Each structure stands twice: as C-alpha cells, then as structure tokens.
Amino acid sequence: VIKPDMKIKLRMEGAVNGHPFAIEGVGLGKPFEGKQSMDLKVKEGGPLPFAYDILTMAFNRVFAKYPENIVDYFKQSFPEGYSWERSMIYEDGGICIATNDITLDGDCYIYEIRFDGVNFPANGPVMQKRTVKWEPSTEKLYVRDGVLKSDGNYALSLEGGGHYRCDSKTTYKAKKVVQLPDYHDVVHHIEIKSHDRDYSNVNLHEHAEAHSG
C-alpha cells in the first residue's frame, strides 16, 4: 500500500579509509511525485573526516515518479520490499561500495545501510572536503539475466571549479515475484538544502522522475 505520503527511518554504519562512523535519519517522501526529504544526524565518528556528498546517494527508487507506460519495479515490490547493492568508482581511485535493505513498518520505510570506501587520496577533494553538489544525473535502468540493474556516470562539482566523476553500478533484488521492467531512465536531482558547520546535522532533498529511453 504505497500511500502518497510515506515515512523514512534509516541507520547507516560505515567506514571511509578505515575510519568508522554511523548516521541515523528520519524523513518523509512522496512516492507518486518523486519527492523525498530527510534529516540526518551523525551518531558516531563525528565530525566526519570526508566529504558528505559521497554518502547522499546511499541515503530508494520508490520515491521516483513513474508514468503509466513504464513498469514500476519499486512500488510493485512492497510490502515485502527490496534491497540493492552498489559500487562507486571515482576518477582518482576512490572506491565505495554500499548496500541498503528496505523493509516496511506500516507506512514507514526502514533502511539498513552499509557504506565503505577506500583509496581516497589524502589530498583529494573527498578527504579535503572540497565538494559542493551533485550535478543532475541520468540513471540507466535495464534487466540482464533475471536481474534489474542500473548504471550511472555522475559528476560532483568542486569548489574552485571543475568536476569529480564517479562511475556507479547498482544491482536490485526484489524479495517477491515482481514484473521486471523494460529499459528506461531515471533523472535525479539531489541537494543538501541545509547543514551545520561540520555536517553532523544535514537536511537532504531528492527529486527523481522516470523517462523512456
């Protein structure tokens, strides 16, 4: 029963270059408008010694407006839910892998997120916190064998100009028998709308809309 208003509760446990951390968040979203928003708080490992922007895409494609002509794999996956696994290879050797197990408690999504990154150069934009925002991204979704997957070429804008590229690959796994969709795109807009000085508190907004190839 995906309702027009849904709640979000999440915990992320992770480490970057071996430094552990934990983040908890609460939020709300509009599945049918493709809109979501959440408040995120650092519980362990603060102040984070890395750019927060590498975590935001880990903090649910149900919050994407799907037209009637495209199969909605994500709204179709509940109340059992689904999970995904993701790799993110940055242009300077930095690599992140993350997972999210999404379940349902009434009208509230529950995220169990794991996030790990290594090989970020000490002088790079991530360890030095020189990232600004994610550019608008186009996610390419497709089904290979019997598995829904997605690819992405994302770009982080840097302070002082330039961009920091990231190659992303995601695997989705439904916990029930759902209709697999046909290839299509999802355009994403993600933005930190507010944060305190050390990002121990963050307000994150996301907007997603599915389009055809």
Residue numbers in the entry: 6 to 64, 68 to 221
Task: Give the article text.
Reversibly switchable fluorescent proteins (rsFPs) are essential tools in super-resolution imaging. Jakobs and co-workers demonstrated that only two mutations around the chromophore in Dronpa led to Padron, the prototype of a group of rsFPs in which the resting nonemissive off-state is the trans anionic form of the chromophore (trans−) which absorbs in the visible. In this work we apply ultrafast time resolved infrared (TRIR) along with TA and time resolved fluorescence (TRF) to characterise in detail the photodynamics in all three chromophore states (cis−, cisH, trans−) of the positive switching rsFP Kohinoor.
The structure of Kohinoor had not been reported. The chromophore structures are similar but not identical and there are also subtle differences in the wider structure. Comparing the two structures, the F176S mutation in Kohinoor reshapes the region around the chromophore. The loss of the bulky aromatic group apparently increases solvent accessibility and relaxes the steric bulk that contributes to the positioning of the neighboring Y162. The resulting shift in Y162 allows S145 to adopt a more favorable interaction with the chromophore, with a reduced hydrogen bond distance of 2.7 Å in Kohinoor, compared to 3.0 Å in Padron0.9, and a more favorable bond angle. The more open local environment also allows for additional conformational flexibility of the chromophore which can therefore adopt a slightly different conformation compared to Padron0.9 most notably in the methylene bridge region. Changes in that region are known to modify excited state dynamics in other FPs and in the bare chromophore. Significantly, the cisH form of Kohinoor, which drives on- to off-state switching, was shown to behave very differently to the structurally and spectroscopically very similar Padron0.9, in that no ESPT reaction was observed in Kohinoor. This was assigned to small structural differences between Kohinoor and Padron which modify the environment of the phenolic group of the chromophore and to the different electrostatic environment and chromophore structure in the two proteins.
